[PDB]
Coordinates of C-alpha atoms and ligand atoms in Angstrom, one line a residue:
Chain Y
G3 CA 2.7 -27.3 -2.9
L4 CA 4.2 -26.3 0.5
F5 CA 4.8 -22.7 1.6
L6 CA 7.6 -22.1 4.1
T7 CA 9.1 -18.8 5.4
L8 CA 12.3 -17.5 7.2
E9 CA 12.0 -14.6 9.7
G10 CA 14.3 -12.8 12.0
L11 CA 16.4 -9.7 12.4
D12 CA 18.9 -8.7 9.7
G13 CA 22.0 -10.8 10.3
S14 CA 20.1 -13.7 11.9
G15 CA 21.0 -16.1 9.1
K16 CA 17.8 -16.1 7.0
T17 CA 19.3 -16.0 3.6
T18 CA 21.9 -18.6 4.6
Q19 CA 19.3 -21.0 6.0
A20 CA 16.9 -20.4 3.1
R21 CA 19.7 -21.4 0.7
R22 CA 20.6 -24.5 2.8
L23 CA 16.9 -25.5 3.0
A24 CA 16.5 -25.2 -0.8
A25 CA 19.6 -27.3 -1.3
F26 CA 18.3 -30.0 1.1
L27 CA 15.1 -30.2 -0.9
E28 CA 17.0 -30.3 -4.2
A29 CA 19.0 -33.3 -2.8
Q30 CA 15.6 -35.0 -2.1
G31 CA 14.5 -34.4 -5.7
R32 CA 11.8 -32.0 -4.5
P33 CA 10.9 -29.1 -6.8
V34 CA 11.7 -25.9 -4.9
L35 CA 11.4 -22.1 -5.5
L36 CA 13.4 -19.7 -3.4
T37 CA 12.1 -16.1 -3.2
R38 CA 12.4 -13.1 -0.9
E39 CA 10.8 -9.9 0.4
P40 CA 11.1 -7.1 -0.3
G41 CA 11.4 -7.1 -4.0
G42 CA 10.0 -10.5 -5.0
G43 CA 6.9 -8.7 -6.3
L44 CA 8.2 -5.2 -7.2
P45 CA 11.9 -4.8 -7.3
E46 CA 11.4 -1.0 -7.5
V47 CA 9.8 -1.0 -4.1
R48 CA 13.0 -2.6 -2.6
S49 CA 15.2 -0.1 -4.3
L50 CA 13.0 2.9 -3.4
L51 CA 12.9 1.9 0.3
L52 CA 16.7 1.5 0.3
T53 CA 17.1 5.3 0.0
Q54 CA 13.7 6.8 1.1
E55 CA 12.4 7.1 4.7
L56 CA 8.6 7.4 4.9
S57 CA 6.0 7.3 7.6
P58 CA 5.4 3.9 8.9
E59 CA 2.0 3.7 7.2
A60 CA 3.4 4.5 3.8
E61 CA 6.3 2.1 4.4
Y62 CA 3.9 -0.7 5.2
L63 CA 1.7 0.1 2.3
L64 CA 4.7 -0.2 -0.1
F65 CA 5.8 -3.5 1.5
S66 CA 2.2 -4.6 1.0
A67 CA 2.0 -3.6 -2.6
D68 CA 5.2 -5.6 -3.2
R69 CA 3.8 -8.5 -1.3
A70 CA 0.5 -8.4 -3.3
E71 CA 2.5 -8.8 -6.5
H72 CA 4.8 -11.4 -4.9
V73 CA 2.0 -13.6 -3.8
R74 CA 0.1 -13.5 -7.1
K75 CA 3.0 -13.6 -9.6
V76 CA 5.6 -15.7 -7.8
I77 CA 4.4 -17.6 -4.8
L78 CA 0.9 -18.9 -5.8
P79 CA 2.1 -20.0 -9.3
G80 CA 5.0 -21.9 -7.7
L81 CA 2.6 -23.6 -5.2
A82 CA 0.2 -24.4 -8.1
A83 CA 3.0 -26.3 -9.8
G84 CA 3.5 -28.3 -6.6
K85 CA 6.8 -26.7 -5.6
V86 CA 8.0 -26.1 -2.1
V87 CA 8.1 -22.3 -2.0
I88 CA 10.5 -20.7 0.5
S89 CA 10.2 -17.0 1.1
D90 CA 13.1 -15.2 2.9
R91 CA 10.7 -12.8 4.8
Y92 CA 7.0 -12.6 4.4
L93 CA 4.1 -10.9 6.3
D94 CA 5.5 -11.5 9.7
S95 CA 8.3 -9.2 8.8
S96 CA 5.8 -6.3 8.5
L97 CA 4.1 -7.3 11.7
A98 CA 7.4 -7.3 13.6
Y99 CA 9.0 -4.2 11.9
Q100 CA 6.1 -1.9 11.1
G101 CA 3.8 -3.2 13.9
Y102 CA 5.9 -3.9 16.9
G103 CA 8.9 -1.8 15.8
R104 CA 7.2 1.3 14.5
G105 CA 3.9 1.0 16.4
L106 CA 1.3 0.4 13.8
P107 CA -1.7 -1.6 15.1
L108 CA -1.7 -5.3 14.2
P109 CA -5.4 -5.6 13.5
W110 CA -5.1 -2.9 10.8
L111 CA -2.0 -4.5 9.4
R112 CA -3.8 -7.8 9.2
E113 CA -6.9 -6.3 7.5
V114 CA -4.7 -4.7 4.8
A115 CA -2.9 -8.0 4.4
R116 CA -6.0 -10.1 4.1
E117 CA -6.5 -8.9 0.5
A118 CA -2.8 -8.3 -0.3
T119 CA -2.0 -11.9 0.5
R120 CA -5.3 -13.6 -0.5
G121 CA -5.1 -15.1 2.9
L122 CA -2.0 -17.2 2.0
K123 CA -0.1 -18.3 5.1
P124 CA 3.0 -20.4 5.5
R125 CA 2.7 -23.9 6.9
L126 CA 5.9 -23.3 8.9
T127 CA 7.9 -20.2 9.7
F128 CA 11.4 -20.6 11.0
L129 CA 12.3 -17.7 13.3
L130 CA 16.0 -17.2 13.7
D131 CA 16.2 -15.6 17.1
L132 CA 19.1 -13.6 18.6
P133 CA 19.7 -10.2 20.3
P134 CA 20.3 -7.2 18.0
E135 CA 23.9 -7.1 19.3
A136 CA 24.5 -10.6 18.0
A137 CA 23.2 -10.0 14.5
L138 CA 26.1 -10.9 12.2
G151 CA 19.4 2.9 18.1
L152 CA 19.2 -0.6 19.5
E153 CA 15.7 0.1 21.1
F154 CA 13.9 -0.2 17.7
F155 CA 15.7 -3.6 17.1
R156 CA 14.8 -4.9 20.5
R157 CA 11.1 -4.0 19.8
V158 CA 11.3 -6.0 16.6
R159 CA 13.1 -9.0 18.2
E160 CA 10.5 -9.1 21.0
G161 CA 7.7 -8.6 18.5
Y162 CA 8.9 -11.6 16.6
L163 CA 8.9 -13.7 19.8
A164 CA 5.4 -12.4 20.6
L165 CA 4.2 -13.5 17.1
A166 CA 5.8 -16.9 17.7
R167 CA 4.2 -17.6 21.0
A168 CA 0.8 -16.6 19.6
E169 CA 1.2 -19.2 16.9
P170 CA 3.3 -22.1 18.2
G171 CA 1.9 -24.5 15.6
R172 CA 3.3 -22.4 12.8
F173 CA 6.5 -20.9 14.2
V174 CA 9.7 -22.8 14.9
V175 CA 12.1 -20.6 17.0
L176 CA 15.8 -21.4 16.6
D177 CA 18.9 -20.2 18.3
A178 CA 20.5 -18.2 15.5
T179 CA 23.9 -18.2 17.3
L180 CA 24.3 -22.0 16.7
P181 CA 26.5 -23.2 13.9
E182 CA 24.9 -23.1 10.5
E183 CA 24.8 -26.8 9.8
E184 CA 23.2 -27.4 13.2
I185 CA 20.5 -24.9 12.5
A186 CA 19.9 -26.5 9.1
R187 CA 19.6 -29.9 10.6
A188 CA 17.0 -28.5 13.1
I189 CA 15.0 -27.0 10.3
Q190 CA 15.1 -30.3 8.4
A191 CA 14.0 -32.2 11.5
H192 CA 11.0 -29.9 11.9
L193 CA 10.2 -30.1 8.2
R194 CA 10.4 -33.9 7.6
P195 CA 7.0 -34.8 9.0
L196 CA 5.4 -32.4 6.4
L197 CA 7.1 -33.7 3.3
Chain N
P2 CA -8.4 25.0 11.0
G3 CA -8.1 25.4 7.2
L4 CA -10.4 24.2 4.5
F5 CA -9.9 21.0 2.6
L6 CA -11.3 20.8 -1.0
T7 CA -10.9 18.2 -3.7
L8 CA -11.4 17.8 -7.4
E9 CA -12.6 14.5 -8.8
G10 CA -13.7 13.0 -12.2
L11 CA -12.5 10.9 -15.0
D12 CA -9.3 11.4 -16.9
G13 CA -9.8 14.4 -19.1
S14 CA -12.7 15.8 -17.1
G15 CA -11.1 19.2 -16.4
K16 CA -9.9 18.6 -12.8
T17 CA -6.5 20.2 -13.2
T18 CA -7.9 23.1 -15.2
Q19 CA -10.4 23.8 -12.4
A20 CA -8.1 23.1 -9.4
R21 CA -5.6 25.6 -10.7
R22 CA -8.2 28.2 -11.6
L23 CA -9.6 27.8 -8.1
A24 CA -6.2 28.1 -6.4
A25 CA -5.6 31.4 -8.2
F26 CA -9.1 32.7 -7.5
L27 CA -8.7 32.1 -3.8
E28 CA -5.2 33.5 -3.7
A29 CA -6.4 36.7 -5.4
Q30 CA -8.9 37.1 -2.5
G31 CA -5.9 37.1 -0.1
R32 CA -6.3 33.6 1.1
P33 CA -3.5 31.3 1.9
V34 CA -3.7 28.3 -0.5
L35 CA -1.9 25.0 -1.0
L36 CA -2.5 23.2 -4.3
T37 CA -1.5 19.6 -4.4
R38 CA -2.4 16.4 -6.2
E39 CA -2.6 12.6 -6.2
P40 CA -0.9 10.5 -7.2
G41 CA 2.5 11.9 -6.3
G42 CA 1.8 14.6 -3.7
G43 CA 3.1 12.3 -1.0
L44 CA 5.6 10.1 -2.7
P45 CA 6.5 11.5 -6.1
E46 CA 8.2 8.1 -7.1
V47 CA 4.8 6.4 -6.8
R48 CA 4.1 7.6 -10.4
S49 CA 6.9 5.3 -11.6
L50 CA 5.6 2.3 -9.5
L51 CA 2.1 2.8 -10.8
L52 CA 3.2 2.4 -14.4
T53 CA 4.4 -1.2 -13.8
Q54 CA 3.0 -3.5 -16.3
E55 CA 0.3 -6.1 -15.3
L56 CA -0.1 -4.8 -11.7
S57 CA -2.7 -6.6 -9.7
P58 CA -5.5 -4.2 -8.7
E59 CA -4.7 -4.8 -5.0
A60 CA -1.1 -3.8 -5.6
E61 CA -2.3 -0.8 -7.6
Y62 CA -4.5 0.4 -4.7
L63 CA -1.8 -0.2 -2.2
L64 CA 0.6 2.0 -4.1
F65 CA -2.0 4.8 -4.3
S66 CA -2.6 4.3 -0.6
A67 CA 1.1 4.6 0.3
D68 CA 1.3 7.9 -1.5
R69 CA -1.9 9.1 0.1
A70 CA -0.6 8.2 3.6
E71 CA 2.5 10.3 3.1
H72 CA 0.5 13.1 1.4
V73 CA -2.0 13.4 4.3
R74 CA 0.7 13.4 7.0
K75 CA 3.4 15.5 5.4
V76 CA 1.4 17.9 3.1
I77 CA -2.3 18.2 3.7
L78 CA -2.6 18.1 7.5
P79 CA 0.2 20.5 8.0
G80 CA -1.3 22.9 5.4
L81 CA -4.7 22.7 7.1
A82 CA -3.0 23.3 10.5
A83 CA -1.5 26.6 9.2
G84 CA -5.0 27.7 8.2
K85 CA -4.6 27.2 4.4
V86 CA -7.2 26.2 1.9
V87 CA -5.8 22.9 0.7
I88 CA -7.0 21.9 -2.8
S89 CA -6.1 18.4 -3.9
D90 CA -6.4 17.4 -7.6
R91 CA -7.7 13.9 -6.8
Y92 CA -8.0 12.3 -3.4
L93 CA -9.5 9.1 -1.9
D94 CA -12.6 9.2 -4.0
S95 CA -10.4 8.5 -7.0
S96 CA -9.4 5.2 -5.5
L97 CA -13.0 4.3 -4.6
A98 CA -14.1 5.1 -8.2
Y99 CA -11.1 3.6 -10.1
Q100 CA -9.9 0.7 -7.9
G101 CA -13.4 0.0 -6.4
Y102 CA -16.0 0.5 -9.1
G103 CA -13.5 0.2 -12.0
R104 CA -11.2 -2.7 -10.9
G105 CA -13.8 -4.4 -8.7
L106 CA -11.9 -4.2 -5.3
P107 CA -14.2 -4.3 -2.2
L108 CA -15.1 -0.8 -1.1
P109 CA -15.1 -1.6 2.7
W110 CA -11.5 -2.9 2.4
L111 CA -10.5 0.2 0.4
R112 CA -12.0 2.3 3.2
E113 CA -10.3 0.3 6.0
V114 CA -6.9 0.7 4.3
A115 CA -7.6 4.4 3.9
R116 CA -8.8 5.1 7.5
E117 CA -5.1 4.8 8.8
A118 CA -3.7 6.2 5.5
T119 CA -5.9 9.3 5.7
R120 CA -6.1 9.5 9.6
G121 CA -9.9 9.9 8.7
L122 CA -9.3 13.3 6.9
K123 CA -12.2 14.1 4.6
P124 CA -12.7 17.0 2.3
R125 CA -15.4 19.6 3.2
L126 CA -16.4 19.7 -0.4
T127 CA -15.5 17.6 -3.4
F128 CA -16.2 19.0 -6.9
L129 CA -17.0 16.1 -9.2
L130 CA -16.6 17.0 -12.8
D131 CA -19.0 14.4 -14.5
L132 CA -17.7 13.6 -17.9
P133 CA -19.2 11.1 -20.4
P134 CA -17.0 8.0 -20.3
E135 CA -16.1 8.0 -24.0
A136 CA -14.6 11.5 -23.6
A137 CA -12.0 10.1 -21.1
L147 CA -2.4 2.3 -15.6
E148 CA -3.5 -0.6 -17.9
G149 CA -7.0 -1.5 -19.2
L150 CA -8.4 2.1 -19.1
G151 CA -10.9 1.3 -21.8
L152 CA -14.5 2.3 -22.4
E153 CA -16.0 -0.5 -20.2
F154 CA -13.7 0.6 -17.4
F155 CA -14.5 4.3 -17.7
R156 CA -18.2 3.6 -17.8
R157 CA -17.9 1.8 -14.4
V158 CA -15.7 4.6 -13.0
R159 CA -18.0 7.3 -14.2
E160 CA -21.1 5.7 -12.7
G161 CA -19.1 4.8 -9.6
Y162 CA -18.3 8.5 -9.0
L163 CA -22.0 9.3 -9.4
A164 CA -22.8 6.6 -6.8
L165 CA -20.3 8.0 -4.4
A166 CA -21.9 11.5 -4.9
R167 CA -25.4 10.2 -4.2
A168 CA -24.1 8.5 -1.0
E169 CA -22.5 11.7 0.3
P170 CA -24.7 14.4 -1.2
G171 CA -23.6 17.1 1.2
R172 CA -19.9 16.6 0.4
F173 CA -20.1 16.1 -3.4
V174 CA -21.0 18.9 -5.8
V175 CA -21.6 17.3 -9.2
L176 CA -21.0 19.5 -12.2
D177 CA -21.4 18.9 -15.9
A178 CA -17.7 18.6 -17.1
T179 CA -18.8 19.6 -20.7
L180 CA -19.9 23.1 -19.7
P181 CA -17.6 25.9 -20.5
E182 CA -14.6 26.2 -18.2
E183 CA -15.6 29.6 -16.9
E184 CA -19.2 28.5 -16.1
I185 CA -17.8 25.5 -14.1
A186 CA -15.4 27.9 -12.3
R187 CA -18.3 30.2 -11.4
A188 CA -20.3 27.3 -10.0
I189 CA -17.4 26.1 -7.9
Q190 CA -16.9 29.7 -6.6
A191 CA -20.6 30.0 -5.7
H192 CA -20.5 26.8 -3.6
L193 CA -17.5 28.1 -1.7
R194 CA -18.7 31.7 -1.0
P195 CA -20.6 30.7 2.1
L196 CA -17.6 28.8 3.5
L197 CA -15.0 31.6 2.9
Ligands
ADP201 N1 24.9 -19.8 12.1 C1 25.8 -18.9 11.6 N2 27.0 -18.8 12.3 C2 27.9 -17.9 11.9 N3 27.8 -17.1 10.8 C3 26.6 -17.2 10.1 C4 25.6 -18.1 10.5 N4 24.6 -18.0 9.6 C5 25.0 -17.1 8.7 N5 26.2 -16.6 9.0 C6 26.9 -15.5 8.4 O1 26.2 -14.4 9.1 C7 25.9 -13.3 8.2 C8 24.4 -13.0 8.1 O2 23.8 -14.1 7.4 P1 22.6 -13.9 6.4 O3 22.2 -15.3 6.0 O4 22.9 -12.9 5.4 O5 21.5 -13.3 7.4 P2 20.1 -12.4 7.1 O6 19.6 -12.8 5.7 O7 19.2 -12.8 8.2 O8 20.6 -11.0 7.1 C9 26.6 -13.7 6.9 O9 27.9 -13.2 6.8 C10 26.6 -15.2 6.9 O10 27.7 -15.8 6.2
ADP202 N1 -14.8 22.7 -19.6 C1 -14.0 22.3 -20.5 N2 -14.5 22.1 -21.8 C2 -13.7 21.7 -22.8 N3 -12.4 21.3 -22.6 C3 -11.9 21.5 -21.4 C4 -12.7 22.0 -20.3 N4 -11.9 22.0 -19.2 C5 -10.7 21.5 -19.6 N5 -10.7 21.3 -20.9 C6 -9.6 20.7 -21.7 O1 -9.7 19.3 -21.6 C7 -8.4 18.7 -21.5 C8 -8.3 18.0 -20.1 O2 -8.4 18.9 -19.0 P1 -7.6 18.6 -17.7 O3 -7.8 19.8 -16.8 O4 -6.2 18.2 -18.0 O5 -8.4 17.4 -17.2 P2 -8.0 16.2 -16.0 O6 -7.0 16.9 -15.1 O7 -9.3 15.9 -15.4 O8 -7.4 15.1 -16.8 C9 -7.4 19.8 -21.6 O9 -7.1 19.9 -23.0 C10 -8.2 21.0 -21.2 O10 -7.8 22.3 -21.8
TYD203 C1 9.6 -7.7 4.0 C2 9.9 -6.6 5.0 C3 11.2 -6.1 5.2 N1 11.4 -5.1 6.1 C4 12.8 -4.6 6.3 C5 13.7 -5.5 7.1 C6 15.0 -5.2 6.6 O1 15.6 -4.1 7.3 C7 14.8 -4.8 5.1 C8 15.2 -5.9 4.2 O2 16.5 -5.6 3.8 P1 16.8 -6.1 2.3 O3 16.1 -5.6 1.1 O4 17.2 -7.6 2.5 O5 18.2 -5.2 2.4 P2 19.3 -4.9 3.6 O6 19.8 -6.4 3.7 O7 20.1 -3.9 2.9 O8 18.5 -4.5 4.9 O9 13.4 -4.6 5.0 C9 10.4 -4.4 6.7 O10 10.6 -3.5 7.5 N2 9.2 -4.9 6.5 C10 8.8 -5.9 5.6 O11 7.6 -6.2 5.5
TYD204 C1 -5.3 9.3 -7.2 C2 -5.7 8.2 -8.1 C3 -5.6 8.2 -9.4 N1 -5.9 7.2 -10.2 C4 -5.6 7.3 -11.7 C5 -6.3 8.3 -12.5 C6 -5.3 8.5 -13.6 O1 -5.6 7.5 -14.7 C7 -4.0 8.3 -13.0 C8 -3.2 9.5 -12.8 O2 -4.0 10.6 -12.3 P1 -3.6 12.2 -12.6 O3 -2.3 12.4 -12.1 O4 -4.8 13.0 -12.1 O5 -3.6 12.2 -14.2 P2 -2.4 12.7 -15.2 O6 -1.4 11.6 -15.3 O7 -3.2 13.0 -16.4 O8 -1.7 14.0 -14.6 O9 -4.2 7.6 -11.8 C9 -6.4 6.0 -9.7 O10 -6.6 5.0 -10.4 N2 -6.6 6.0 -8.4 C10 -6.3 6.9 -7.5 O11 -6.4 6.8 -6.3
CL205 CL1 -22.5 14.1 2.8
MG206 MG1 19.2 -11.8 4.0
MG207 MG1 7.5 -6.7 0.9
MG208 MG1 0.9 -7.0 3.7
MG209 MG1 6.7 -15.4 7.6
MG210 MG1 -5.1 16.4 -14.5
MG211 MG1 -2.4 8.4 -4.6
MG212 MG1 -6.1 5.0 0.4
MG213 MG1 -11.9 13.6 -3.2

């Protein structure tokens, strides 16, 4: 299998590009599974967090419980069948939002995640970058945006950072260009 | 300052019975008391999540931990800060026994998760009601309860100042008197 993720602020085009990427792979005859966080593991976590505000620690731990189920019940089985699995958000979302955004320490986040994810990491992560005011109270969102960019510059072999303000088809073509060597 | 006390033991061991008797006993002495419980003292909706069929044990622990994090921050630490005796019917040792010894999750990882979740908060005393496993989430069968029961006893041997191990099969009033005797010098 091949594991790919989409990351970025809300309104950065993740769901759009994940859809277009799955469609590209379908056109090439490649088995593909599209999934998302939160809720790919525990739908009830997503719906709970829609209407409950918690401490950052509790928030993260719920995202992590979802992720633990998501990895085991959805992603790993898809990869085991040889599918390309695309997740619209994954662990980097917690690192950016709960870590850089709400201030939780990354080493702890990563120790929690080590068991939650079974160490599963995407081969490539497409970060759709734009300022919060361009996404289709701002201080939090700037911390998240900058946090994503920090994660990306720490792992330049995994992250591909794209200008989320470009036209959709152009972004999709850029994702395809980056992906083709790996298929 | 406050005083933090917990009750632990298998399902059916008398924890709730004793926690409530203790709360009333201490209140009758004029002490401010806060009685709480896990799971649900932090995030009541966690009890719904915990019933999910076929949960991985990692997800199960993470749910318990999310509740615990909210519980410690929003309920227990503020109660202690007001000088209350805070009694929790279950706390972290439940996860160590059930998710660690029972489900087989690694104890150090459970503790690392917990360290931020609990902000390091540990009870002064933990009353372990030791119940035979046959007298006692999915897969809560005999084999599991034997592992949990023995796991609790291991935790108690490892922290023998904090744990007070009591025979859960003794009469309710005898157990209550034993709990009271351990607390007298602290209150
Ligand atoms: N490159 C783009 N240019 C203009 N509009 C876009 C682009 N990509 C997505 N959209 C539109 O922007 C909004 C957010 O896209 P979406 O894919 O839902 O982002 P996310 O999942 O990151 O929140 C949607 O209305 C979508 O149709
Ligand atoms: N010391 C005891 N001896 C016999 N039965 C007991 C004793 N303590 C409690 N019980 C009974 O055992 C059952 C379980 O008690 P409970 O306090 O709910 O345990 P837990 O909260 O540990 O599950 C209840 O029916 C209760 O009345
Ligand atoms: C996966 C994940 C998401 N999130 C946040 C980012 C988004 O604000 C939200 C996901 O939103 P989602 O459930 O797509 O709903 P909405 O589109 O109504 O925001 O969850 C985290 O904070 N941490 C995480 O680990
Ligand atoms: C607090 C906690 C409880 N548990 C289990 C013990 C019980 O089987 C279940 C609920 O505990 P509890 O609420 O004490 O029991 P009840 O539903 O009878 O009121 O959760 C764990 O597995 N780990 C934990 O961390
Ligand atoms: Cl001790
Ligand atoms: Mg989306
Ligand atoms: Mg999640
Ligand atoms: Mg995680
Ligand atoms: Mg990712
Ligand atoms: Mg009870
Ligand atoms: Mg709990
Ligand atoms: Mg915990
Ligand atoms: Mg305890």
